[PDB]
Amino acid sequence: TSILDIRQGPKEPFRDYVDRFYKTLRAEQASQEVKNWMTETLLVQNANPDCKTILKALGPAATLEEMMTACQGVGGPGHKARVLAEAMSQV
Amino acid sequence: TSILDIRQGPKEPFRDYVDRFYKTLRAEQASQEVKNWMTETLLVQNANPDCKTILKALGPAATLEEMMTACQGVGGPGHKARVLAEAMSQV
Amino acid sequence: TSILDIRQGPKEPFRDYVDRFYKTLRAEQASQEVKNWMTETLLVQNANPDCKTILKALGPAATLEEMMTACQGVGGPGHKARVLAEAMSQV
Amino acid sequence: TSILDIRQGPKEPFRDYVDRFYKTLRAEQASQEVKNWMTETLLVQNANPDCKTILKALGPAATLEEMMTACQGVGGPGHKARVLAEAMSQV
Amino acid sequence: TSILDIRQGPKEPFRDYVDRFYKTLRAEQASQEVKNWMTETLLVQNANPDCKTILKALGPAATLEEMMTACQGVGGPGHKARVLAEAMSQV
Amino acid sequence: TSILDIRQGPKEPFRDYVDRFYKTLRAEQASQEVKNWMTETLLVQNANPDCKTILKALGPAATLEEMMTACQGVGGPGHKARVLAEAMSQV
Numbered sequence: 108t109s110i111l112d113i114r115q116g117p118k119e120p121f122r123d124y125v126d127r128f129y130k131t132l133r134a135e136q137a138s139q140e141v142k143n144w145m146t147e148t149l150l151v152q153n154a155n156p157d158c159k160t161i162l163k164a165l166g167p168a169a170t171l172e173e174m175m176t177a178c179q180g181v182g183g184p185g186h187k188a189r190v191l192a193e194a195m196s197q198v
Numbered sequence: 199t200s201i202l203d204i205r206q207g208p209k210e211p212f213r214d215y216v217d218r219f220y221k222t223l224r225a226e227q228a229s230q231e232v233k234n235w236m237t238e239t240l241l242v243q244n245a246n247p248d249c250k251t252i253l254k255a256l257g258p259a260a261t262l263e264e265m266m267t268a269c270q271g272v273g274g275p276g277h278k279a280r281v282l283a284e285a286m287s288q289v
Numbered sequence: 290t291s292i293l294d295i296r297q298g299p300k301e302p303f304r305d306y307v308d309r310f311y312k313t314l315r316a317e318q319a320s321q322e323v324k325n326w327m328t329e330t331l332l333v334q335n336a337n338p339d340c341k342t343i344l345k346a347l348g349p350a351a352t353l354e355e356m357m358t359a360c361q362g363v364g365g366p367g368h369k370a371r372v373l374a375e376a377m378s379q380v
Numbered sequence: 381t382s383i384l385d386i387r388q389g390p391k392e393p394f395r396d397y398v399d400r401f402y403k404t405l406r407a408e409q410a411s412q413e414v415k416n417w418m419t420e421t422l423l424v425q426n427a428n429p430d431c432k433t434i435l436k437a438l439g440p441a442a443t444l445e446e447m448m449t450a451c452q453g454v455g456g457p458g459h460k461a462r463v464l465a466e467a468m469s470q471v
Numbered sequence: 472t473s474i475l476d477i478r479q480g481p482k483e484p485f486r487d488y489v490d491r492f493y494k495t496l497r498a499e500q501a502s503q504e505v506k507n508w509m510t511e512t513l514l515v516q517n518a519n520p521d522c523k524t525i526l527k528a529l530g531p532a533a534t535l536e537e538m539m540t541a542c543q544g545v546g547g548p549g550h551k552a553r554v555l556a557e558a559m560s561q562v
Numbered sequence: 563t564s565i566l567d568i569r570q571g572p573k574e575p576f577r578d579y580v581d582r583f584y585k586t587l588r589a590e591q592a593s594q595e596v597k598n599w600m601t602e603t604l605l606v607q608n609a610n611p612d613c614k615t616i617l618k619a620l621g622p623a624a625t626l627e628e629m630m631t632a633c634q635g636v637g638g639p640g641h642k643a644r645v646l647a648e649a650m651s652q653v
């Protein structure tokens with residue numbers, strides 16, 4: 108069980124993914140700075156596309172609470188209705 | 199396990215979220231007034247968007263039974279059909 | 290675990306909700322008449338909107354078998370298709 | 381646990397419902413003829429609407445294998461697509 | 472637990488159904504030729520309609536790997552979208 | 563439990579499928595080169611159609627991280643909305 112393998116499922120909510128991410132990070136053989144850099148790269152690098160869109164919309168300099176607050180709607184009725192409406196609109 | 203971390207899932211019903219909220223609140227090192235203020239801030243602050251819409255519609259001075267009664271339809275067939283209909287209508 | 294807290298989930302079928310309702314009612318400190326009045330008030334008062342619509346359509350003087358028979362379709366394919374069709378029709 | 385209480389869930393497949401029906405019937409205090417009559421009344425009487433439609437379409441003199449074969453499509457993609465198409469068509 | 476009772480659920484994937492089919496077949500009191508004939512009759516006879524369509528499309532002289540390969544898409548997004556599109560098209 | 567039997571479910575995410583694939587591969591009686599060839603044939607050969615489309619789009623010379631990164635969106639809201647939009651568009 109390594110940190111590079113923690114990938115977000117297509118239907119897994121973002122909070123469970125980040126929970127598994129830090130849980131695996133606490134059990135990884137690496138220094139503190141390396142764990143911080145992994146937090147700044149792999150946590151967003153290994154997300155699902157539906158959340159990588161919103162996380163890419165927040166841009167850099169976004170805190171963890173802002174990311175989780177911005178992605179906790181993915182999956183819910185409003186987000187699915189909006190995504191389907193945009194898909195039918197553009198196609 | 200802290201109180202600031204209890205966040206509502208995108209598909210979790212509101213009643214389970216408030217149940218976990220008070221369950222974690224009973225096991226938090228804080229005075230009574232602090233627990234009341236946390237109840238008045240974090241419970242609505244850390245909800246999912248689909249319920250934050252209705253809770254924002256009820257406005258302040260709304261009791262817990264009014265919130266739970268107003269949000270227990272989120273997820274059900276009628277709410278999903280209405281949200282999808284509005285999404286197709288505006289887009 | 291009190292009787293006032295038994296609320297129907299947005300996706301829970303009506304039969305499971307009434308099962309939990311009577312199960313909790315048998316373990317509540319109240320007289321027989323009080324349990325009957327609770328059966329006549331809270332069981333319909335604390336239902337989800339999708340079932341409160343049909344239970345409101347049956348009106349008073351409706352037996353338990355009539356309620357459960359009228360609400361056991363909520364969630365199924367026909368009910369979801371009809372609700373979505375009405376939502377698209379009115380919007 | 382009585383036989384009159386075995387009701388089909390809105391999303392439960394017909395085979396699980398009839399399995400619970402006969403399982404409860406084997407543990408009911410009634411004679412053989414009474415169990416046969418219960419099989420001929422309650423098994424179809426206490427089904428969900430989506431299956432009561434097809435079972436009503438088969439009419440009487442239909443065997444158990446014909447009922448289960450006719451209702452094992454309820455829930456699947458084809459049945460949901462057809463029901464939704466008819467709902468959008470009539471509304 | 473007999474072999475005639477193993478029926479595919481409306482939402483069960485074909486691989487789980489055939490797994491239960493052979494698992495029950497190994498524990499059935501019948502000769503080898505009888506088990507082969509049961510494999511050639513009941514495995515396709517007792518499938519759900521959504522898979523009986525594709526298995527009927529493959530025709531006879533189709534191997535097990537061809538059946539499972541042809542039916543492993545039932546349920547997935549592409550198959551549901553195609554079935555719904557055809558349902559809306561014909562209705 | 564053989565390696566030829568590990569097939570991806572219609573709703574199983576790709577990461578769970580490849581996890582079971584390597585887990586079963588580590589417990590298979592075969593040399594290293596044979597396990598590598600099995601990795602280069604069966605892992606893509608025995609996928610579901612929704613992922614075989616994207617894996618066929620990546621073409622050969624694609625690494626495992628590229629495959630998993632390209633298929634982790636299958637199932638999510640965006641992929642389902644896009645597939646449904648294309649299905650309604652072509653039909």
Ligand SMILES: O=P(O)(O)O[C@H]1[C@H](OP(=O)(O)O)[C@@H](OP(=O)(O)O)[C@H](OP(=O)(O)O)[C@@H](OP(=O)(O)O)[C@H]1OP(=O)(O)O
Nearest residue numbers: 118182184187278364365369455460482546551573637642
């Ligand atoms: O009433 P159901 O037949 O069980 O329909 C559900 C429902 O889909 P729809 O509301 O779009 O019909 C779920 O949607 P949610 O609101 O839970 O999001 C969806 O789950 P996904 O969100 O993952 O799409 C799930 O689909 P799946 O089979 O892929 O789990 C699908 O169930 P059926 O596909 O069995 O209809």
